[PDB]
Amino acid sequence: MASLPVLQKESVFQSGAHAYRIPALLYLPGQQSLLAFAEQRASKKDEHAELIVLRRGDYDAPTHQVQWQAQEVVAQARLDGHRSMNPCPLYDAQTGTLFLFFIAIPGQVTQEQQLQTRANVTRLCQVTSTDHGRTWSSPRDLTDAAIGPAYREWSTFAVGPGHCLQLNDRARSLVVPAYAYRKLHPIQRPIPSAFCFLSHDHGRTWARGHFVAQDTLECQVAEVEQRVVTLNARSHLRARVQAQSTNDGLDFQESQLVKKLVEPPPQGCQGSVISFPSPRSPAQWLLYTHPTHSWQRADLGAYLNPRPPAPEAWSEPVLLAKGSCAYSDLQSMGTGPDGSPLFGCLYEANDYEEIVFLMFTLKQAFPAEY
Numbered sequence: 048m049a050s051l052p053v054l055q056k057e058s059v060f061q062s063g064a065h066a067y068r069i070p071a072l073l074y075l076p077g078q079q080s081l082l083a084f085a086e087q088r089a090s091k092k093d094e095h096a097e098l099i100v101l102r103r104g105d106y107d108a109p110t111h112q113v114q115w116q117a118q119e120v121v122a123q124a125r126l127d128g129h130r131s132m133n134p135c136p137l138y139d140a141q142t143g144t145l146f147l148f149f150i151a152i153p154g155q156v157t158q159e160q161q162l163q164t165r166a167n168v169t170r171l172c173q174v175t176s177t178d179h180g181r182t183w184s185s186p187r188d189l190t191d192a193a194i195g196p197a198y199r200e201w202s203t204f205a206v207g208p209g210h211c212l213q214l215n216d217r218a219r220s221l222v223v224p225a226y227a228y229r230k231l232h233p234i235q236r237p238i239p240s241a242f243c244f245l246s247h248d249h250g251r252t253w254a255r256g257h258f259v260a261q262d263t264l265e266c267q268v269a270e271v272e273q274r275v276v277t278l279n280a281r282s283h284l285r286a287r288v289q290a291q292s293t294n295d296g297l298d299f300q301e302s303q304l305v306k307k308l309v310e311p312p313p314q315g316c317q318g319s320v321i322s323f324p325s326p327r328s329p330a331q332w333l334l335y336t337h338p339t340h341s342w343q344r345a346d347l348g349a350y351l352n353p354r355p356p357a358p359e360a361w362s363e364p365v366l367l368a369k370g371s372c373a374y375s376d377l378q379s380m381g382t383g384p385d386g387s388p389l390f391g392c393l394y395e396a397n398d399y400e401e402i403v404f405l406m407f408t409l410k411q412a413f414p415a416e417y
């Protein structure tokens with residue numbers, strides 16, 4: 048009945064003068080620290096979003112606990128007159144550059160206004176850091192270069208939220224998960240589909256991967272090794288949509304509903320997925336966190352896939368948190384104190400009144416594998 052006993056459970060963000068939503072977590076292996084991002088909003092409503100905040104956490108080996116420094120606004124992550132949303136961090140292990148992708152929307156123009164008028168006013172931006180997130184560059188609007196001609200083809204769009212991916216391909220490509228409401232029919236309402244922005248030159252130039260042939264919203268990607276990019280997306284079909292790409296994110300040749308991974312009504316909820324070194328035939332396994340309630344957003348659970356990307360290989364969930372739970376973001380942190388893979392998890396709880404940090408090992412979550 049009680050949730051999973053974990054190495055650590057701590058509220059890193061709480062409602063106060065501002066509300067906090069949309070967590071994003073990034074582990075910096077060489078720094079042994081975590082970057083927890085979130086949207087600082089004037090209220091819980093989406094259009095009241097303002098800026099992006101950040102807390103740097105340091106993992107202490109002797110105590111196997113993470114101590115978090117004070118939150119601070121990522122001042123550079125914004126466009127004049129625009130509110131910032133959807134933080135999507137990424138660490139380029141080859142250049143050491145830290146990327147923070149996000150979207151910027153004029154004042155309080157809602158997503159609904161853009162959908163109803165089929166008029167896109169959302170911007171794709173990024174800020175980078177060469178000192179691991181301590182200081183950030185001026186924002187760069189990627190809209191023209193990354194979206195260009197397709198801009199008029201979408202009612203609106205977003206990236207993430209959550210951590211991105213860097214492939215172990217030749218060019219060490221950067222992959223940013225996203226979705227867009229595409230204007231396909233003259234009368235029918237534009238349908239959203241997930242896809243990935245791609246960069247083969249470490250963020251210098253960008254291109255758009257093709258759409259998952261499914262009605263999908265927020266998604267995240269992971270790579271498993273031949274080399275496959277598995278995409279896990281939110282959908283209104285009461286189940287998650289999972290798609291695989293064997294051509295590094297450009298196209299998703301296969302996709303389907305994973306009924307075992309429930310989505311609450313009426314339009315599901317965002318979830319997170321990551322790959323990590325297998326404790327044993329396949330090289331990597333997958334971990335996925337998401338609410339497990341079928342009627343509302345509650346009971347955050349962790350699922351395991353020991354034979355990725357096989358949809359039928361997803362395990363039954365393990366209860367991570369009881370009660371109201373929503374968005375989450377996962378990160379593989381290496382080896383835990385018990386010799387098994389260590390994981391960090393950031394998630395919205397208690398009717399969006401706090402964002403909780405959870406840290407646990409594979410041994411704790413899935414002991415049957417041991």
Ligand SMILES: CC(=O)N[C@H]1[C@H]([C@H](O)[C@H](O)CO)OC(C(=O)O)=C[C@@H]1O
Nearest residue numbers: 069093132133158205264265315316
């Ligand atoms: C950019 C934006 O408004 N994102 C919002 C997202 C979006 O409405 C949905 O993915 C369909 O477009 O939904 C939710 C949500 O808690 O369900 C909060 C996000 O802030």
